[PDB]
């Protein structure tokens, strides 16, 4: 019902090798050239990637900044309020980004800022100009 395990004998392959006299050698050559063609495309990308791997030499180590470990605070200084308006004008509704810019305001405190100071800081007009970009 099935061939010996390891052998591959399909009705499709038997016909493609018995089609003519040298149909066997012909099939075995198109696979040889396909192997050579794939093999040299490897060393081509293997060489393209080897050059890119040297541009990334050093990583981004001369560009990292130390970690600001500051405790989360509750009250809003007038400075932190003005930081929030500029961050809204630049980042919109990215609460995580605005939280990181202010520094000591959690993500939920930033969301509450959108509602409490909604009228006084014209957060509606500021958001509609971030959307104009």
């Amino acid at each position: 019902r099935k061939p010996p395990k390891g052998m591959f004998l399909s009705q499709e392959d038997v016909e493609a090798v018995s089609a003519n006299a040298t149909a066997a050698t012909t099939v075995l050559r198109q696979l040889d050239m396909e192997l050579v063609s794939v093999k040299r495309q490897i060393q081509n990308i293997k060489q393209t990637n080897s050059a890119l791997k040297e541009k990334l030499d050093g990583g981004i180590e001369p560009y990292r900044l130390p970690e600001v470990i500051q405790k989360c605070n509750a009250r809003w200084t007038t400075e932190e309020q003005l930081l929030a308006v500029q961050a809204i004008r630049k980042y919109g509704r990215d609460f995580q980004a605005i939280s990181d810019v202010i520094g000591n305001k959690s993500v939920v405190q930033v969301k509450n800022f959108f509602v409490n100071y909604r009228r006084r800081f014209n957060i509606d007009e500021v958001l509609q100009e971030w959307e104009a970009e």
Binding site: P4, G6, M7, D13, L28, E34, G59, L65, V101
Partner: protein, 666 residues
């Protein structure tokens, strides 16, 4: 198998069922109730048991009925009908046995038997046992035919047969109890030595043997599961199938490689996109860090816009550094996935030159068995006789297989050095024309009621014919002769003065250099008491080595043996014999094979006798006059001695039923 059921197995009969041959002679029993069939089946098995328990004396009907028990021994005409059937068809009282009832004083009918091989000798013994005048005509100066034994000094080696392929169900087991045969088992161990002269490691010997046996099953799958049996209106041969299977395996080796390196370009190209993304991110990071620096240079105090600029750049720079880190994480995954694929490559090749050579040795081993190159064997039917293989180890005739036909020829009218030239059969009898092989002008005429032709298939194939038939054989017979294959394999006997090989090893092999020469001296056999090595020439080399002198053949043998055992350990042979069966005008080959486009049904066609046309137009249907026996005439046991032995008993039963009558059919 043991008991009365073992006697049936030993006689190649089912113990619990009536055969087709038995149904023809006992149609009242097989069509009757089940209880009667079991009685008949017991009487047959019990009679076979008595004969096989002591095959050196004739088993008479009186002795059979005496050792039967009730209720089986009550019906006497049944016991008589069974005993006469078994005796007539060579199932009991065949071979060489002491006779209790002396032969009839006067003979009935005249039969001329062409050829005194085992098939002809067995038939002559039976026909004479039944009380007929039998005369054999042998072209050679000896009996045995293709059972040929070279004897010189203490050296005895068979160019003929010399192997019994198991005793379980073999009629030769009965003959071996009648004739002093020295049967010795063959040890299956066989080391391989490459052309350089060193042995093949057990790693390769087994890995190539398994692949060989795997390739064979693949052809059987091609034949019985894909119907791959015709190609361009021509029948497919076993050689063609093996070539197709191997190429498909070499094709699959390349398909596996292409799909493996394709997994590398796909992975390596994801790395290319990733590195291009990282090199652009490191660019934005380098520019952003510069802007954050310039924004920090603005020394305090500053308005909230300048403070927002530093805080903004610090966030955007930290956000890009988190992206670059997550990309370097992905780079580690893909970079190690490449060393994963580049460390586990698929097989480089299916088989190498060193492997393909050892595989050729196993193919030559198959060409030795069927005595023909695999390009001629029928893909579907080449092994059709495997289903009837005997049980037990194979044994050699250590004292020379010629002791069997010589002992059979005792007391027979054998005309040696008599070459049959013409066989004339008409509705009123036959006449065989033969000449003396020494002085061919001396002509002999033999009149007879029937002719039994056991000529080898190679002789029946000659063109122009060595034997003319008058009238010509019908087309259905001649066409069968042409379709059937008659192979060729030769033996080289080397008689030394001392043993220099491994005594506990009965055979060792020599790996040929090329596919063309793969059967040229590929196997050596130590099977005799005296220091006698025997080398085989099979396949396509069998026919070509017959055009080469014995000195050059023995020279290639000593060269092979010197590379294996030592340049100074191989002495010169004292006696050498090289067989050439294809050139033998009385054999024209070794034995038969099932050629492509043929089948086992041609074996049955070879056995059907020939009936001439009526003498007087309008006369009743004439009697069959020309009968055929021999190695090539028995479907289930061709190309063997026991097959020839059985075919002779078969025709002797049919010829006797034709000219003496069958009194057991009532």
């Amino acid at each position: 198998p043991s008991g009365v059921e073992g006697a049936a197995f030993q006689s190649r009969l089912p113990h619990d069922r009536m055969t087709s041959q038995e149904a023809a002679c006992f149609p009242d029993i097989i069509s009757g109730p089940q209880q009667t069939q079991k009685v008949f089946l017991f009487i047959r098995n019990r009679t076979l048991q008595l004969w096989l328990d002591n095959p050196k004396i004739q088993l008479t009907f009186e002795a059979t009925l005496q050792q039967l028990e009730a209720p089986y021994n009550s019906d006497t005409v049944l016991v008589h009908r069974v005993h006469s059937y078994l005796e007539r068809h060579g199932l009991i009282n065949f071979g060489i046995y002491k006779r209790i009832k002396p032969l009839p004083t006067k003979k009935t009918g005249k039969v001329i038997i062409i050829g005194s091989g085992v098939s002809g000798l067995a038939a002559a013994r039976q026909l004479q046992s039944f009380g007929m005048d039998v005369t054999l005509l042998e072209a050679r100066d000896r009996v045995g035919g293709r059972v040929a034994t070279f004897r010189k000094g203490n050296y005895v080696a068979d160019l003929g047969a010399m192997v019994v392929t198991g005793l379980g169900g073999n009629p030769m087991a009965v003959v071996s109890k009648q004739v002093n045969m020295e049967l010795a088992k063959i040890k299956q161990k066989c080391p391989l030595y490459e052309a350089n002269g060193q042995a093949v490691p057990k790693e390769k010997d087994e890995m190539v043997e398994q692949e060989f046996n795997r390739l064979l099953e693949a052809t059987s799958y091609l034949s019985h599961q894909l119907d791959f049996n015709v190609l361009n209106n021509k029948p497919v041969s076993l050689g063609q199938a093996l070539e197709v299977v191997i190429q498909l395996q070499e094709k699959h080796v390349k398909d596996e490689q292409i799909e493996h390196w394709k997994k590398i370009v796909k992975t390596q190209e994801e790395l290319k996109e990733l590195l291009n993304k990282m090199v652009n991110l490191k660019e934005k990071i380098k520019e952003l860090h510069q802007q954050y620096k310039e924004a920090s240079e603005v020394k305090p105090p500053r308005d909230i816009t300048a403070e927002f600029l530093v805080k903004s750049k610090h966030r955007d720079l930290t956000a890009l550094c988190k992206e670059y880190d997550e990309l370097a994480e992905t780079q580690g995954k893909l970079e190690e996935k490449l060393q994963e694929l580049e460390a586990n490559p698929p097989s480089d090749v299916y088989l190498s030159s060193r492997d393909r050579q050892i595989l050729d040795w196993h193919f030559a081993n198959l060409e030795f068995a069927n005595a023909t190159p695999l390009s001629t064997l029928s893909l579907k039917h080449w092994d059709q006789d495997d289903d009837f293989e005997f049980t037990g180890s194979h044994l050699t005739v250590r004292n020379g297989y010629s002791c069997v036909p010589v002992a059979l020829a005792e007391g027979l009218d054998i005309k040696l050095n008599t070459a049959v030239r013409q066989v004339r059969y008409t509705a009123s009898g036959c006449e065989v024309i033969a000449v003396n092989t020494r002085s061919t002008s001396q002509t002999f005429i033999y009149k007879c009621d029937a002719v039994l032709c056991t000529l080898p298939l190679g002789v029946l194939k000659q063109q122009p014919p060595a034997v003319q038939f008058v009238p010509p054989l019908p087309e259905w017979k001649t066409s069968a002769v042409q379709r059937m294959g008659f192979g060729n394999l030769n033996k080289v006997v080397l008689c030394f003065d001392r043993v220099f090989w491994d005594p506990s090893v009965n055979l060792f092999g020599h790996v040929g250099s090329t596919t063309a020469s793969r059967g040229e001296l590929f196997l050596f056999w130590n099977l005799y008491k005296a220091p006698i090595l025997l080398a085989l020439v099979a396949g396509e080399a069998a026919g070509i080595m017959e055009n080469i002198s014995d000195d050059v053949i023995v020279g290639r043998c000593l060269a092979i043996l010197k590379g294996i055992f030592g340049s100074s350990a191989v002495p010169q042979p004292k006696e050498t014999v090289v067989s050439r069966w294809r050139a033998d005008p009385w054999a024209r080959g070794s034995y038969s094979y099932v050629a492509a486009g043929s089948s086992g049904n041609d074996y049955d066609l070879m056995a059907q006798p020939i009936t001439p046309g009526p003498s007087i137009p309008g006369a009743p249907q004439p009697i069959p006059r020309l009968f055929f026996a021999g190695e090539h005439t028995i479907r289930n046991y061709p190309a063997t001695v026991h097959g020839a032995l059985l075919s002779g008993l078969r025709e002797a039963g049919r010829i006797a039923d034709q000219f003496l009558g069958a009194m057991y059919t009532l």
